[model samples]
Target: PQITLWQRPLVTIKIGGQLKEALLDTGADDTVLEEMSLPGRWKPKMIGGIGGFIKVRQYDQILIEICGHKAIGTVLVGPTPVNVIGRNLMTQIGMTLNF
Candidate 1:
């Protein structure tokens, strides 16, 4: 799907057997989701954000369905302003920025 830079690139995504909205952020290196319970053992990961750096739980090989396209990758669960689909998952879903 072709997206314009005029609006927020928000889209529906499925994760943890539930549907939720997320932002397609090209600037983010890892996909970060809001604090939630996900099955699996995760490691403590610290990442930098807009305001400052925060600690997050890094879950590897998580399945996320984005706009009906499924991609398995590492997902970070932590306190975030909003759920974001980063370049890690974007590349798997074949999402590219076009001018």
Candidate 2:
């Protein structure tokens, strides 16, 4: 499916056994969530983007279901202005540009 770069391709995703909608951001390399209580332990990391820098908890090999497609990858937990679904998961779900 073709979509404009400006398009905010919203889709429902599951994390920590919870469902949430997220905005697709190809420019981003890591998925970010507003905040969530994740099982097991996670490592602390810093993330910087258009909104400056912030600390986040990086959880590895977590189950994420998007558009009915499932994947296990890295998920960043923190205070995000909006839930962002980055390339890591996008690629997992077979998203690509025709060009």
Candidate 3:
């Protein structure tokens, strides 16, 4: 018998100078950071998306560390009613979908 296992890389973001773990999802088209998940001094703003310019907040840029890999970028400080990993960071890493 044989078994198979799959694992994706995890990325870290800084929210109010705090570190948070985020999953790398190629299926996502944009990166989203929730306001509730962050700390103080993080303001959220409304930004436009596929559906149009939505109300998205602003947050602080944290050091992103991904399993020995690191990058500095800004995160959308908003209410992630449905938390998801989008393609915002995926494209930067050059990822492709198989299905």
Candidate 4:
């Protein structure tokens, strides 16, 4: 199915039983959540963005829901002002450029 990128390139997604508005970033390599209590095994990693670097928790086997479509993959949790769904999860849903 084709994905619709909102005027601000944002999309409603569900992760860990919670819904959030995330930026659908085609340039990002991994999905980043604002903040959450991740279960299972995970590791600490640093992710650099426009605002430099920030610490994040990388977890495996995370289930993400995008517009009724589901994909299981790695999810990064950090102190982000907003949630971002990157290419990893995007491609899993066969979603790419729509505009």
- Candidate 4: worst 10 consecutive residues by lDDT? 1-10
* TM-score between candidate 4 and the true structure: 0.87
Which has the better lDDT: candidate 2, or candidate 4?
2
lDDT leaderboard ranking: 1, 2, 4, 3
Write the number of the candidate with greater lDDT, choosing between 3 and 4.
4
Best by lDDT: 1
Q: Model 1: per-residue lDDT, tens digit, 30-76?
A: 99999888887999999998899999999999999999999998999
For model 4, residues 8-63, the per-residue Cα lDDT tens digits are 67778988798888988887898999878777999998999888998999999988
Candidate 3 structure lDDT: 0.54
Misplaced by over 4 Å in model 4 are: 1-6
Q: What is the C-alpha lDDT of each candidate?
A: 0.94, 0.87, 0.54, 0.86
Residues forming the 10-long window of minimal summed lDDT in candidate 2: 1-10
Clashing pairs in 1: none
The whole-model C-alpha lDDT of candidate 1 against the native structure comes to 0.94
lDDT of 4 at 78: 91
What is residue 55's positional error in candidate 1, in angstroms? Answer: 0.3
Off by over 4 Å in 3: 1-19, 36-54, 59-62
Tell me the tens digit of each residue's lDDT in model 2 across 1-99. 566766677888887778898988878999998877877899999989886998999999989998778999999999887899999989999998666
Per-model TM values vs. the true structure: 0.96, 0.88, 0.48, 0.87
